[PDB]
Amino acid sequence: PIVQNIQGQMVHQAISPRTLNAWVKVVEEKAFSPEVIPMFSALSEGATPQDLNTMLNTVGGHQAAMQMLKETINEEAAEWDRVHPVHAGPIEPGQMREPRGSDIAGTTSTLQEQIGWMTNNPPIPVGEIYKRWIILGLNKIVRMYSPTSILDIRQGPKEPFRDYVDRFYKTLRAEQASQEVKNWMTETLLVQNANPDCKTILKALGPAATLEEMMTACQG
Amino acid sequence: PIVQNIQGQMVHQAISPRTLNAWVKVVEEKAFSPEVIPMFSALSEGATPQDLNTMLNTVGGHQAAMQMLKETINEEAAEWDRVHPVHAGPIEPGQMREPRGSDIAGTTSTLQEQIGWMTNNPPIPVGEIYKRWIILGLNKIVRMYSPTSILDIRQGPKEPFRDYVDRFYKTLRAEQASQEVKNWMTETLLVQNANPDCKTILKALGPAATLEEMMTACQG
Amino acid sequence: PIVQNIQGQMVHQAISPRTLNAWVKVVEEKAFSPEVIPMFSALSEGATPQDLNTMLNTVGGHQAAMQMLKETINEEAAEWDRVHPVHAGPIEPGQMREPRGSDIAGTTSTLQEQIGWMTNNPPIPVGEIYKRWIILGLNKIVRMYSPTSILDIRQGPKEPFRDYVDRFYKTLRAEQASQEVKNWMTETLLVQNANPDCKTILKALGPAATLEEMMTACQG
Amino acid sequence: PIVQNIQGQMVHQAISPRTLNAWVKVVEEKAFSPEVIPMFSALSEGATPQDLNTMLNTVGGHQAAMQMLKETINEEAAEWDRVHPVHAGPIEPGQMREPRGSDIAGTTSTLQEQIGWMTNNPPIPVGEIYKRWIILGLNKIVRMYSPTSILDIRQGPKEPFRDYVDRFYKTLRAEQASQEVKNWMTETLLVQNANPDCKTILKALGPAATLEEMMTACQG
Amino acid sequence: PIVQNIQGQMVHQAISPRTLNAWVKVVEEKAFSPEVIPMFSALSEGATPQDLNTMLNTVGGHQAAMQMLKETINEEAAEWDRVHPVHAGPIEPGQMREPRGSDIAGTTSTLQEQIGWMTNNPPIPVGEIYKRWIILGLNKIVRMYSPTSILDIRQGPKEPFRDYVDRFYKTLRAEQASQEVKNWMTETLLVQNANPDCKTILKALGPAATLEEMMTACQG
Amino acid sequence: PIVQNIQGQMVHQAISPRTLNAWVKVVEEKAFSPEVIPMFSALSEGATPQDLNTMLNTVGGHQAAMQMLKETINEEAAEWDRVHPVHAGPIEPGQMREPRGSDIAGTTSTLQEQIGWMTNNPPIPVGEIYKRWIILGLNKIVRMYSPTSILDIRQGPKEPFRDYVDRFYKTLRAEQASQEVKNWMTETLLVQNANPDCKTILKALGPAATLEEMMTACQG
């Protein structure tokens, strides 16, 4: 990644083996939870595209998700190349060339070019765009990983409300929807597929109530 | 997080994977206990709000408590933006914008803005307020996760006194009772809900019994 | 903990996560052992009262022992406040006020107050006093947690002599007594509850003999 | 590995114990898979030839693969010496001699020689060449270590489609070939060895469709 | 222990929590091996008497051995106090007082006095003397702990010569003897208590043969 | 060990417990094999002779090899003091004494003398010579620990060729034979002691067969 030394100039520090060790171990141990992508965001803070490529390639198994994320990367690179033209000519000092989709992906680029692109003024967030593409691919993978849909979960006769709402939110973290409609979902589907006794309890208490008072009323 | 160098000038540092792995193990390992709130307050000391958001998003399971803490964060942010109005329209040169309800948590604010806010003169303790809000949320969570009320604790005919008083003090620390009423009830409910033989033995000692006397006399 | 080093001494660093994790592991794994007092004295060498409070709050289980420690600390703080009364009237400018009985425990004080108290000229060692309070509480805890008394220790016909004396000295170290009676009680209790063969051996050796010859006499 | 940083570049640090211990543990645990190639490339970012020799000597077992890697490195060094002949006669003063074919492997060279060759102006990327040699060796190793060919992969009546395509892509990644025929072989082999239900599903969908729709089609 | 900062004055660093964790762990994990003593010499390089006392007292179990080593420490302190007189009077700056036996033991001394005694000119190796006493006590305990004597080991009919000489050297490392006579045992008894076939082989080869060639002759 | 700071001046550092913990574990986990020598050479790089002595003393078990390496060190020191006589009687001011046979190993020499010797201008590579002697001793040890000779390696009737050639190269790497004779025998003994059908296939393939061709033909 990129770090700043105390009273020093911006220099690029090498990758940490312990980070890759934790990253390879956590994905295998935790399978594919939604939080895995978030975990990815914390481990790849300010990392170069080569670091993300190595982190993705070092994962053992799950080559289908790797092929899917590679296809999404190729599609995003093609879209970026189509929306942003490419110019050629002499390279003036202090100004970098036009980054291409193959250069944004980092498959046909080197380390020094990426370092010069990320340390220029103004900085070109190539690593940030690549990280956004990777987390979008991971979101797609975790959505495909979801066994039960958001509308297929229903509270059973003997299943408690705590585990019910826990599984409901776990499935909601893995469905495909925007935040605006996600709010309506987590508002109405939580009371539409609940236990009938607690359904009547919440209807008597009020739909606009928060989750805390609803749970405290459903427990009693 | 935030570290202090020997020179005197501090710099930004990314979240270390070791602390995140330790937090995940503690959460997985102990579920929820009144002792995890000090663990979180001592582990995330001097950390950016983005680090706390990543730590709260990387947890696996128990999404009910996560939704509870999110709702408490939203309510605290609403109260903050209601009690602190933006009376100053224009912004002076060199001064950063005031943290709003959504900016204090880090939803629509980048890390650079948080760094500039926390390193201001005088500094703006946004991270401290966020940590206090998370502590209040975890307090509410551990209060809800209480198995039963404080009055239902009754020592059985063959249940020992050690585990009895341990569970009693556990559910008392997990209770939302104030410091005065806790000290008022710890002198009555401990002696009124004990084994009858021991209960009479402790009552025959006097009204100035200490914890060590209660432990050494009940066990005889 | 406080960091007294080269120029730049004005610095306060929170407790390291590794030391706190090691403390949690040694508390969870070994419960309470006669060696936990040196462990606490080594892990909390020169720490601020807030650090001691955070270490005492992260303990898992054994709420009765923690309540005993808290009440002993409160009693000793009351005794300190009684023996060291606070002077009334206005305080002198530039002179830090003397820490009160409750200020040592860190229940009604802040971080800056104890930082200025420990870094004053001359420094006020309130942290050492709090550590003494905690180790006295731990001594009371390990004395209360004694399962078997010292007089109920008798070696069986098959139990080895080395394990017998190890258990005896462990139980003796778990109990706190004056130094002038322990050297007599060990000699008047060890050579009486041994194996008949080892008893005849030690009678053939001598009462006033050392312990190494007793260990190497009845070995095997 | 060599460290290029702030003033004081004339430094050389040996291989860290955490890196070497992790590499030996990961290679034994993961045996041989295509995945090791990026892990080795990330662990040896900017390392000295002696560091690569130590990393290749630390591995235990699988002597045949190590001998194959050594003979491939020797053949490639002979080819480099044939294509880059060394100039005869006396060398110019102050100009470092070009690295010979055997000097790249580090068998007849010292530490100061490669230090001067890497810190020269302009630098000579001999370490990158040796890393490419080791990467080609590992490619040949993982190509010869393939237990089952790509054509002998057929999904059983009860084996899931996801696991089938995962095994297929793992076997395809284990083998190295031109991507222009890979694009054709994956499409002419994936949709031929599936279950009859998934086969008729993909026939109703279409051959020119993407892979994610095939994954989400025959799921469950 | 004591460390020297880069271009700084001699400062005292606190105890190492990770090293202490290892030390407590090694004793339990390794049982009681003779190699444990060097272990202490490597982990306690330049350690203070207070740190040594904490490391001794933090050990769980072996209370009999702890009492024995404490008795040896008391005897050494009494011998030191008897061989070196003690003088009293005004303490001049730059010169410390005469250390007593209890002061060398560290039971009645403090950290500042220990630092002043170890950082004087010329330095008083109080820590070195205490470490020598501790390693002598550990040598005594490992001599008493030896189950089989040095003269009781004999090569069996089916016991390999490698294991025989390994156990012989393990018993020689734990036996009590001087450095000069130590060679006599490994030169005479090693060939006098072996299998008759290799006995005759070594007698025909020559007594002055070394261990390597004598074993290669005994193996064949 | 010895570390190099960005300033330019190096200082002494105590042995880290992590390296020795790994060293004790690696010796026990990997037993004895060719790979132990490189690990040893890469882990103890730039360490004082006292650190290597402690590492050779903290090992648990296999005391025969320890005595072998001790006798090898003694013989090398004897040869050193025989070939390097002390012709200079007096010592110049500011210069330290020359390392003798017993001083080069650190038996009767303190750590300060070794520090002054290794930090001289020009430095005296005592640690490098000690490491070379230990490497020669370990080579002799792994040569002795060979289960069988190289000529006795013969593939069985049904034993696969992979493990056969693995054991062949394993017992050939530990052999003290020169590179020329090893390269001469690896072309003949590998094909002369193989499976008859495979042997005939490899002989009919031609006299210029390489490793990969033999691996691909012998398995068909």
Q: What string of DSSP letters covers F38-93?
A: HHHHHHSTT--HHHHHHHHHS--S-HHHHHHHHHHHHHHHHHHHHHS-----S--T
Cβ–Cβ of C20/B6 closer than 8 Å?
A: no
Q: Using H for helix, E for strand and C for coil, what is the string for A71-104?
A: HHHHHHHHHHHHHCCCCCCCCCCCCCCCCCHHHH
Strand B11-12, strand E10-12: pairing: unpaired
Q: Where are the alpha helices (DSSP H) in chain B?
A: 17-30, 36-43, 49-57, 63-83, 111-118, 126-144, 161-173, 179-185, 189-192, 196-203, 211-218
Q: Please state, in angstroms and rounded to a whole number, the distance separating the CA atoms of residues E183 and E187.
A: 6
Amino acid in the structure at residue C132: R
Q: CA-nearest residue of chain F to E6?
A: F11
List helix spans (H) across chain F. 17-30, 36-43, 49-57, 63-83, 111-118, 126-144, 161-173, 179-185, 189-192, 196-205, 211-218
d(CA C40, CA C55): 9
Which residue intervals of chain A bear CATH 1.10.1200.30? 161-219
User: d(Cα E44, Cα E52) in Å, to the nearest integer?
Assistant: 7
C-alpha pair distances (Å), D47 with each of B70, D52, D59, D107, F19: 46, 7, 17, 16, 21
Residues of B in contact with C5 (CB under 8 A): 6
Q: How many other CB atoms sit within 10 Å of the CB of residue E7?
A: 10
Q: How far is CA C55 from CA B133, C80, C99, in A?
A: 22, 23, 22
D14 interfaces chain F, CB cutoff of 8 Å: yes
Pairing of strands F11-12, F2-3: antiparallel
Q: Tokens 């303790």 belong to which residue?
A: B125
Question: Within chain C, what is the greatest distance between any pair of CA atoms?
Answer: 76
Residue B94 token pair: 């060199």
Q: What is the DSSP letter of E58?
A: T
Contacts of E118 (CB under 8 A, 6+ apart): E2, E48, E124, E125, E126, E127
With residue E10 as reference, give the H or E element that holds it: strand E10-12
Chain centroid offset of residue D83 CA: 24
Residue listed under structure tokens 């490189």: F38
Put simply, the answer to whether C212 touches E144 (Cβ < 8 Å) is: yes
* Residues in chain F within 8 Å Cβ distance of D54: 38, 41-42
Task: Please answer whether residues C174 and C150 qualify as being in contact, where contact means their C-beta atoms are separated by less than 8 angstroms.
Answer: no
Alpha helices by DSSP H, chain C = 17-30, 36-43, 49-57, 63-83, 101-105, 111-118, 126-144, 161-174, 179-190, 196-205, 211-217
Instruction: Determine contact, residues F67/F35, Cβ cutoff 8 Å.
Output: no
**Cβ–Cβ under 8 Å, residues B38 and B48:** no
> What residue type is assigned to position F32 of the chain?
F
- First-to-last C-alpha distance (Å) of chain A: 52
Distance, in Å, from the CA atom of F23 to the CA atom of F138, rounded to the nearest integer, reads 14
Selection from C141, C175, C139, C135 nearest residue C68 by Cα: C141
- Bin E59: left if φ > 0, else alpha if -120 < ψ < 50, else beta: beta
Cβ neighbours of D220 in A, within 8 Å: 147
Measured over all CA atoms, what is the biggest interatomic distance in chain E, rounded to whole angstroms?
75
E30 touches chain F (CB under 8 A): yes
- On the CB side of B104, how many CA atoms lie within 13 Å of its CA? 24
Rounded to whole angstroms, the maximal C-alpha distance in chain D is 76
B169 vs C: CB within 8 A: yes
Q: What's the token pair of residue F19? A: 């390296």
d(CA C182, CA B151): 46
Residues 6+ apart with CB under 8 A from A94: A120, A121
Structural method: cryo-EM
Q: Supply C18's token pair.
A: 């590794």
Interface C-E, measured as beta-carbon pairs within 8 A, has a size of 71
In chain F, CATH 1.10.1200.30 covers: 161-218
Quote the distance between the C-alpha of residue D34 and its chain's center: 7
From C93's Cα to the closest Cα of chain E, the distance in A is 31
- Cα–Cα distance, B101 to B82 (Å, whole number): 9
Report d(CA D145, CA D174) in Å as an integer: 8
Measured distance CA(D205)–CA(D187) in Å, rounded: 14
CATH, domain range C161-217 = 1.10.1200.30
Q: How far apart are CA F101 and CA F78, in angstroms?
A: 6
**Fold assignment, A161-219:** 1.10.1200
Tokens of A178: 């925007």
| Kind plus residue range of the DSSP H or E element containing A145 | helix A126-145
CA A204 from chain centre, in angstroms, equals: 39
The fold adopted by the segment(s) F161-218 is 1.10.1200
**Nearest by CB: D22 against A21, A57, A68:** A21
Structure-block tokens of residue E199? 């006995």
Rg (CA), chain B: 23
Tokens of C134: 């905690």
Taking alpha carbons only, the member of A199, A200, A128, A208 closest to residue A164 is A199
CA A148 to chain centre: 20
Q: For chain B, give the number of residues.
A: 220
What residue type is B204 in one-letter code? Answer: A
> CB-based contacts of A210: which residues, under 8 Å, 6+ apart?
B71, B75
Q: Taking CB atoms and an 8 Å cutoff, what residues of chain D touch A57? A: 35, 37-38
Rounded distance between C-alpha atoms, residue B56 and residue F184, angstroms: 64
**Which residue of F3, F39, F212 is in closest CB contact with D144?**
F212
The encoded tokens of residue D116 equal 């001067």
Are the beta carbons of F55 and F24 closer than 8 angstroms? no
- Total residue count of chain D as it appears in this document: 220
Is F74 an interface residue toward E (CB < 8 Å)?
A: no
Looking up tokens 């530990």 gives F174
Cα pseudo-dihedral B180, B185, B186, B190, rounded to 10: 180
State the smallest CA–CA distance between residue D29 and chain F in angstroms.
14
Q: What is the 3-state secondary structure (H, E, C) of D34-100?
A: CCHHHHHHHHCCCCCHHHHHHHHHHCCCCHHHHHHHHHHHHHHHHHHHHHCCCCCCCCCCCCCCCCC
3-class state of residue A11 by DSSP = strand
d(CA D86, CA A16): 38
The DSSP symbol for D2 reads: B
Beta-carbon neighbour count of residue C41 at 10 Å?
A: 20
Choose among C110, C108, C106: nearest CA to C130.
Answer: C106
Q: Using alpha carbons, list the distances in angstroms from residue E128 to D200, E85, F87, F110.
A: 83, 20, 35, 12
Chains D and A touch (3+ CB pairs under 8 A): yes
Nearest CA to F27 out of F57, F70, F49 is that of F57
Q: Please say whether the beta carbons of F106 and E38 come within 8 A.
A: no
Instruction: Tell me if chain D has a CB within 8 Å of the CB of A149.
Output: no
CATH superfamily of A2-145: Human Immunodeficiency Virus Type 1 Capsid Protein (1.10.375.10)
Whether A21 and chain D come into contact, CB under 8 Å, resolves to yes
The CA distances from residue B134 to B32, B71, B147, in Å, are 14, 11, 22
A interface mutation test: which of D25, D139, D171, D215 has the most A CBs within 10 A?
D215
Among chain A residues, CA nearest to B57 = A35
Q: What CATH fold (topology level) applies to the domain E2-144?
A: Human Immunodeficiency Virus Type 1 Capsid Protein (1.10.375)
Report in angstroms the alpha-carbon separations of A41 from A32, B34, F7: 15, 29, 35
Q: Radius of gyration over alpha carbons of chain A, in Å? A: 23
Q: Are B62 and A170 in contact (CB under 8 A)?
A: no
The CATH topology of domain C17-144 is Human Immunodeficiency Virus Type 1 Capsid Protein (1.10.375)
Residue from D27, D35, D48 whose CB has the most chain A CBs within 10 Å, to mutate = D35
The residues that bridge with F11 in the sheet, in sequence order, are: F3
Q: For residue F146, what are the CA distances in angstroms to A178, E169, F33, F138, F168? A: 67, 22, 9, 12, 11
Q: How far apart are CA F131 and CA F47, in angstroms?
A: 9
Distance between CA atoms of residues D133 and D127, nearest Å = 10
CA angle E183, E188, E194 (to 5 degrees): 125
